[PDB]
C-alpha cells in the first residue's frame, strides 16, 4: 500500500 | 549518461522448430529514453512488448523487451539498441548458447 | 525467509510538449504487483499479480488517488530542481524515488528506506535511523531543511515501521501460493569447444525465484578466478530469473572444474561437473 503524502522538494 | 548493457536470449533452452520467447534485457543506462528493436533477418519484429521501467540501486534503468519466436537453422535474430550514449545503434545477435 | 515491499517512481520531463512521463511500480520481493503509467489509457493503479486483484474498490481508488498525487509532486519537483540547479527549460530531466521496508524471517520490521535522485545521482535519502537525512549537495540541503520543518521523516518512519510492514504482511499471506514459494534453480552444464585444445564450460541456473543467487567456479576444490565470465542476473519474462557462469578450460581437463550454486531454494548448495 502506497504512502499517502509526499512533501515537495 | 551511462551506456546500456545488452543481453539477448531466449526464455527457454532453444530447440529449432519449437515455440519460445526472444528477450532483450537492457540495463545500466541513464537517461531512460531508449530505442530497442528485436530483429528477424535484419527486419524489425512488430509485436514486441516490454516491461515497466524500473531501476537499480545506482539509479540506472532496466527494461525487458520480448516477443514470441521460433528458432530455426536458417533465421537469425538480434536486438538493436539506440541511446544518447551510443554513436550509432548497437546490434547484438542472439546466440542460443548464451 | 526475509521479505520486502518496495515502490519505484520515475518521472521524466518533456520540454517539447506536455507534462512529465510518470511510471510507478510496486514489488513484493522480486514480484511486481502494481503499476501505473501516465501514458497508459486507464489512468489507474493496475494489478500485476493475481493475489492483489482480490482487493476491493476502496483499495484501487485510494492507490490511484495516491499515485496520481505523487505524479504531481514529481512534476512540481522537476520545476523546483530546474531552478535550484540553474538549468534551462529546454532540457529533459529525471527524478527517481524508491522506498520500502524489509521484514525478517519472523515477519518483523528490519529496516526501512526512502531515497531520492535527480538526473540519476543521489539527491536526498533517509538514513537508517529513519530520523535523519543525507543531502548530497547544497541544493539538497535546501530540501533537507524544508523537510525537517514539515515533519517528513516523522511520517516516513511511521509508515515504514507501521503501515508498510502491515500491508507487506497482508500481501505475503494473500499471495502465499507464490510469494512464499521458492523456485530453486534448474541447473545444467553445457560444453562449447573453442579449438581442439580449449573449451568453454557454461553453468546455467534457470527459472529460479527469488533473483538472489551465487554461481562460482572451482578448480581442484579452490576458487577459480581466471578466464571466468559471469553475466548479470536477468529476468526470464515469466516472473523467474536466469544466470550463467562460464570458464575456459584445456580440453580433456573438464573434470577438475566444478560449478557451485547457492540459492535460498536449495537446502545445501549444489555442485555440477561436466561428464
Ligand atoms: Cl528448422
Ligand atoms: Cl498467488
Ligand atoms: Cl556438448
Ligand atoms: Ni538479425
Ligand atoms: Ni518533449
Ligand atoms: Ni522530522
Residue identified by cell 561436466 is C274
b/e map B36-47, b = 16+ CB within 10 Å: bbbbeeeeeeee
Question: Cell for C138?
Answer: 547544497
Candidates C38, C124, C52, C126; CA nearest to C81 is: C124
CA end-to-end span of chain A: 22
Q: How far is the CA of B81 from the centre of ligand 4 (A)?
A: 13
Residue identified by cell 540547479 is C85
Question: Cell for C218?
Answer: 572451482
Supply the DSSP symbol for C209: B
Q: Is the peptide bond before C210 cis (omega within 30 degrees of 0)?
A: yes
Question: Cell for C252?
Answer: 580433456
CA distance B37 to B78: 8
CA distance C68 to C90: 25
CA distance C27 to C100: 9
Q: What phi and psi values does residue C220 have, to the nearest 5 degrees? A: 45, 50
**Experimental method for this entry?**
X-ray
The CA angle C227-C274-C257, to the nearest 5 degrees, is 40
Residues with Cβ within 8 Å of residue C177, at least 6 apart in sequence: C51
CA distance C148 to C129: 15
CA distance B60 to C121: 9
Residue identified by cell 521458492 is C182
Residue identified by cell 482487493 is C55
CA distance C185 to C229: 19
Find the residue in C nearest to B66 (Cα). C237
**Residues C60 and C78: beta-carbon distance below 8 Å:** no
Tell me the nearest-neighbour CA distance from B54 into chain C, angstroms.
7
The resolution, in angstroms to one decimal, equals: 2.2
**Residues C116 and C123: beta-carbon distance below 8 Å:** yes
Candidates C34, C31, C28; CA nearest to C9 is: C34
Residues with Cβ within 8 Å of residue C268, at least 6 apart in sequence: none
CA distance C63 to C160: 17
Specify the length of chain A in residues.
Answer: 9
Contacts of A2 in chain C (CB under 8 A): 7, 26, 63, 66-67, 70
**Residues B22 and B10: beta-carbon distance below 8 Å:** yes
Candidates C14, C64, C21; CA nearest to C39 is: C21
**Residues C32 and C48: beta-carbon distance below 8 Å:** yes
Residues with Cβ within 8 Å of residue B29, at least 6 apart in sequence: B2, B3, B4, B5, B60, B61, B83, B85
Separation in Å, CA C34 to CA B73, B89, C60: 40, 32, 10
**Residues C120 and C94: beta-carbon distance below 8 Å:** yes
C154 is in an annotated binding site: yes
Q: What phi and psi values does residue C13 have, to the nearest 5 degrees? A: -75, 155
Question: Cell for C215?
Answer: 554461481
CA end-to-end span of chain B: 27
Find the residue in A nearest to C116 (Cα). A9
CA distance C62 to A5: 12
Amino acid at each position: 500500500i502506497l504512502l499517502n503524502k509526499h512533501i515537495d522538494a | 549518461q551511462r551506456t546500456p548493457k545488452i543481453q539477448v536470449y531466449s526464455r527457454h533452452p532453444a530447440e529449432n522448430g519449437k515455440s519460445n520467447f526472444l528477450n532483450c534485457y537492457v540495463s545500466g543506462f541513464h537517461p531512460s529514453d531508449i530505442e530497442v528493436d528485436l530483429l528477424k533477418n535484419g527486419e524489425r519484429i512488430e509485436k514486441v512488448e516490454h516491461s515497466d521501467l524500473s531501476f537499480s540501486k545506482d539509479w540506472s534503468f532496466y527494461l525487458l523487451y520480448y516477443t514470441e519466436f521460433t528458432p530455426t537453422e536458417k533465421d537469425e535474430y538480434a536486438c538493436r539498441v539506440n541511446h544518447v550514449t551510443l554513436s550509432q545503434p548497437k546490434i547484438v545477435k542472439w546466440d542460443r548458447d548464451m | 525467509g526475509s521479505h520486502s515491499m518496495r515502490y519505484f517512481f520515475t518521472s521524466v520531463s518533456r520540454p517539447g510538449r506536455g507534462e512529465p512521463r510518470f511510471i510507478a511500480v510496486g514489488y513484493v520481493d522480486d514480484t511486481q504487483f502494481v503499476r501505473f503509467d501516465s501514458d497508459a489509457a486507464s489512468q489507474r493503479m493496475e494489478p500485476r499479480a493475481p493475489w492483489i486483484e482480490q482487493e476491493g474498490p476502496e483499495y484501487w481508488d485510494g492507490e490511484t488517488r495516491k499515485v496520481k498525487a505523487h505524479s504531481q509532486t514529481h512534476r512540481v519537483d522537476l520545476g523546483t530542481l530546474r531552478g535550484y540547479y540553474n538549468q534551462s527549460e529546454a532540457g529533459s530531466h529525471t527524478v527517481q524515488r524508491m522506498y520500502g521496508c524489509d521484514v525478517g524471517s519472523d515477519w518483523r520490521f528490519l529496516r526501512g528506506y526512502h531515497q531520492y535522485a535527480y538526473d540519476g545521482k543521489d539527491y536526498i535519502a533517509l538514513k537508517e535511523d529513519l530520523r535523519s537525512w543525507t543531502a548530497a549537495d547544497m541544493a539538497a540541503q535546501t530540501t533537507k531543511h524544508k523537510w525537517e520543518a514539515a515533519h517528513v521523516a516523522e511520517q516516513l518512519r511511521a509508515y515504514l515501521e507501521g503501515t508498510c510492514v502491515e500491508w507487506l504482511r497482508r500481501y505475503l499471506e494473500n499471495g502465499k501460493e507464490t510469494l512464499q514459494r521458492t523456485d530453486a534453480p534448474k541447473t545444467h552444464m553445457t560444453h562449447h569447444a573453442v579449438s581442439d585444445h580449449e573449451a568453454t564450460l557454461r553453468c546455467w541456473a534457470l527459472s529460479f525465484y527469488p533473483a538472489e543467487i551465487t554461481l562460482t567456479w572451482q578448480r581442484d576444490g579452490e576458487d577459480q578466478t581466471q578466464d571466468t565470465e559471469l553475466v548479470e542476473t536477468r529476468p526470464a519474462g515469466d516472473g523467474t530469473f536466469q544466470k550463467w557462469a562460464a570458464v575456459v578450460v584445456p580440453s580433456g581437463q573438464e573434470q577438475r572444474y566444478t560449478c557451485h550454486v547457492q540459492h535460498e531454494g536449495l537446502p545445501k548448495p549444489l555442485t555440477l561437473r561436466w561428464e
